[PDB]
Design a protein around this ligand. Structure first.
Ligand SMILES: *[C@@H]1O[C@H](CO)[C@@H](O[C@@H]2O[C@H](CO)[C@@H](O)[C@H](O)[C@H]2NC(C)=O)[C@H](O)[C@H]1NC(C)=O
Ligand SMILES: *[C@@H]1O[C@H](CO)[C@@H](O[C@@H]2O[C@H](CO)[C@@H](O)[C@H](O)[C@H]2NC(C)=O)[C@H](O)[C@H]1NC(C)=O
Lengths: 99, 92
């Protein structure tokens, strides 16, 4: 799913918290009315990550790949290609860290 | 050789600056890898030109030509001619 920027606005505020909004209504005498229909949605938090972005002939990005996702994904970011030829490739080094 | 660790010992303060020199960190690895990749191509073409691994017959009559120096030593754990082991001593 490619998302274009709608508007880039001068906001200048830090937003640390939020909640969504709803549209409900009133009903009349039945055995007040509220909660029109059903409502559910999806939320996830962002995070800095390095993606390789494959544009199309028309600039429509299809394939994106995260580099840090797995030790396999970090090598595809080294070749910059979505095709990985048969062989051995050297992904970024690892270090043991101090206790 | 890992440029990031070599230049900047395990410290992001130096790691950040290294990002400003761009590919200097990476392209060295590409150079070194470029060397180390072909280093096995050298040994590839020099030593293995042979399709199959031959081995001498069990018994040697060559007409009096004694090759027991140059042939693999059956007793050494690594089978190597008596001569070759002289070399592995002299080099370190
Ligand atoms: C973002 O807004 C938060 C307020 O929610 C500010 O962060 C606070 O910073 C102080 C230190 O000056 C901490 O003691 C508070 O705990 C922080 N708030 C929270 C909720 O943890 C912050 O100042 C704002 N951003 C900027 C850039 O100033
Ligand atoms: C080939 O040479 C080797 C050594 O150069 C010979 O092996 C020796 O044989 C004698 C018997 O004549 C023994 O006393 C030695 O102890 C052997 N030396 C070693 C290192 O094994 C071998 O006999 C020769 N064979 C032929 C066909 O020439």
């Amino acid at each position: 799913s490619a998302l274009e920027p709608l508007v880039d606005l001068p906001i200048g505020i830090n937003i640390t918290r939020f909640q969504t909004l709803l549209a409900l209504h009133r009903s009349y005498l039945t055995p007040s009315g509220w909660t029109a229909g059903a409502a559910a949605y999806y939320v996830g938090y962002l995070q800095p990550r390095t993606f390789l972005l494959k544009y199309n002939e028309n600039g429509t990005i299809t394939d994106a790949v995260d580099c840090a996702l797995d030790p396999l994904s970090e090598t595809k970011c080294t070749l910059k290609s979505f095709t990985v030829e048969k062989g051995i490739y050297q992904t970024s080094n690892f270090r043991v860290q101090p206790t | 050789v890992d440029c990031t660790m070599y230049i900047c010992g395990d410290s992001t303060e130096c790691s950040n600056l290294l990002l400003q020199y761009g590919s200097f960190c990476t392209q060295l690895n590409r150079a070194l890898t470029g060397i180390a990749v072909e280093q096995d191509k050298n040994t590839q073409e020099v030593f293995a030109q042979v399709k199959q691994i031959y081995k001498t017959p069990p018994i040697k009559d060559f007409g009096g030509f004694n090759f027991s120096q140059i042939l693999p030593d059956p007793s050494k754990p690594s089978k190597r001619s008596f001569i070759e082991d002289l070399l592995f001593n002299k080099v370190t």
